[PDB]
Design a protein around this ligand. Structure first.
Ligand SMILES: Nc1ncnc2c1ncn2[C@@H]1O[C@H](COP(=O)(O)OP(=O)(O)OP(=O)(O)O)[C@@H](O)[C@H]1O
Ligand SMILES: Nc1ncnc2c1ncn2[C@@H]1O[C@H](COP(=O)(O)OP(=O)(O)OP(=O)(O)O)[C@@H](O)[C@H]1O
Ligand SMILES: [Mg+2]
Ligand SMILES: [Mg+2]
Lengths: 317, 295
């Protein structure tokens, strides 16, 4: 599904940095992104033979919503500058592109290995969408921080930072991870040590007979269990939970997504022990890529739901 | 000795290792953790014992953990050191090439110095930011970043450069594009006859001029300057320092046109290593160029 939003725009630039094998990703914003969206990484960079080509199998979960290929769509909607340097390249380069993806000017640019993609005046070519962007900047910015917090939690060993600047004012911190190898440590960088106190780690269990009978699972149905689930969830004790689903993140094969059925189940089991609060949820479902399809479709999903409810109940008891 | 002198040596080690990415991690402004991560050359295993000079002083004053990976090494290594510099434990550690030096509980071995650190954490952190902003501005083509986390709060970005090859962009990354508006680039001129006579310099004295000066300074127009010397950085061969005579002179010329404000100063002095020799020639060149710029 094609989408043109602030959340889908930053997501593609981050995906490009992750695919490049980057360990440092810096996101710079101005006017919540209305004026500038800049993503800098120390990844592989782009070779000179692929400079013109910048703008011209198992299911990918991130491709549920594309933007506008992203880089060609971005040039048609704003002004894009790209400075990059490949390891095989002696000197880096700085590129300016027009609205059709043509390289306006290319100059040698001495810079460390990696790529920096700058997106200035997003949606400037569409005055109707640009005004709707400015008017609903609070909602577009809220959706972007949620996707940004999701990549920070799951990207262990990668330093992800973000700042925002309004007018001539000072840069404002948004989110920052320390390059920690564990997901638990990343949660402490995004939300603080206070958030980690009311959390318990997910402990997977085989589906119980009571839960298996609720979903209609035979002993044969559950024998080929290939779901490996891990993460953290809020304690079921009254008071330690949250008031909404504002901090609930889900991942399939380390890709942020939203399985509506899984989400309704995890919240329902929490309501069985804390009807007045919502849990903090960070949960990754590890499964073979072939068993995942996009219409989110998961083979033996009834077996996955039985494991989650059984494990959540055993933890909350 | 101090928090400012501790980060300075760790940055020098990363710079000397040929690093292009330098990350500084702090906790409680550095009272709890001082961590510097780079993508430099790393250390080979045969030189692990020789690591412990700044690094020897750091182990004697805190607990130091070092994770590194050499280009010739398949997998990195993680080292824990005691207060004598001895490797407590050495374990293989999968990490990208480079080095990460962690300094935890600085001055813990000296209860007197540790307490003075916490009591004066506001002043010591300001001195470290002055040393940190200097390396961000001068390290062209090097990504220098810093983060800090206080207590149970979240980690927050402090400063970050983009690896730009120019000093002007590094100034814009540290202080913002607004700072770049009231600045003019230094334009070097030969020392004036009037300025040469003030210092007692013959015409022969100025023929062997080896001073190459560059950088940026605030405009002398009233109002665009700053209220203090908070943003004045000086460099000799791209090394941050404070030449008192040079610093006093630059502020004196600025006051000649703006008596009520102090300039923003970023100045690098390039000179032959043996030479400060012939400082009267350097001051004559410095005073002459600033006047020609401010006229
Ligand atoms: N930060 C980056 N670092 C290195 N290469 C990049 C970077 N960003 C883009 N590229 C290169 O530009 C090309 C086009 O990127 P684009 O996002 O438009 O499509 P794609 O990444 O190839 O596929 P898709 O976005 O649909 O998953 C990429 O193939 C990549 O080689
Ligand atoms: N980030 C680093 N990356 C690679 N090698 C390092 C790093 N830090 C230290 N080393 C190596 O360990 C040795 C000890 O460092 P130390 O700072 O104590 O002394 P030095 O760097 O040789 O000179 P000085 O202490 O006078 O500045 C260094 O010589 C260097 O070879
Ligand atoms: Mg892409
Ligand atoms: Mg040294």
């Amino acid at each position: 599904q094609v989408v043109l939003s602030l959340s889908t725009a930053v997501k593609e630039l981050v995906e490009n940095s992750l695919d490049a094998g980057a360990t440092n990703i810096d996101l710079k914003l101005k006017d919540y992104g209305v004026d500038l969206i800049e993503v800098s990484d120390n990844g592989c960079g782009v070779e000179e033979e692929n400079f013109e080509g910048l703008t011209l199998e198992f299911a990918d979960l991130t491709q549920v919503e594309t933007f506008g290929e992203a880089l060609s769509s971005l040039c048609a909607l704003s002004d894009v500058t790209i400075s990059t340097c490949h390891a095989s390249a002696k000197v880096g380069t700085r590129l300016m592109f027009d609205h059709n993806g043509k390289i306006i000017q290319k100059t040698p640019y001495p810079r460390p290995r990696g790529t920096t993609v700058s997106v200035q005046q997003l949606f400037s070519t569409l005055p109707v969408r640009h005004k709707e962007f400015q008017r609903n900047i609070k909602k577009e910015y809220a959706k972007m921080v949620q996707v940004l917090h999701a990549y920070c939690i799951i990207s262990a060993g990668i330093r992800v930072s973000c700042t925002n600047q309004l007018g001539q004012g000072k840069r404002q911190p948004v989110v920052c991870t320390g390059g920690s190898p564990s997901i638990k440590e990343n949660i402490g960088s995004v939300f603080g040590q206070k958030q980690l106190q009311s959390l318990i780690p997910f402990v997977q269990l085989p589906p119980s007979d009571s839960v298996c009978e609720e979903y209609g699972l035979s002993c044969s149905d559950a024998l080929h269990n290939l779901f490996y689930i891990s993460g953290f969830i809020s304690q079921c004790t009254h008071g330690v939970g949250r008031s909404s689903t504002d901090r609930q993140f889900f991942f399939i094969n380390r890709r942020p997504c939203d399985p509506a059925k899984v989400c309704r189940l995890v919240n329902e089991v929490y309501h069985m022990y804390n009807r007045h609060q919502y849990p903090f949820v960070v949960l990754n479902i590890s499964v073979d890529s072939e068993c995942v399809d996009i219409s989110i479709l998961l083979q033996e999903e009834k077996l996955l739901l039985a494991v989650l409810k059984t494990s959540l109940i055993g933890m909350f008891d």
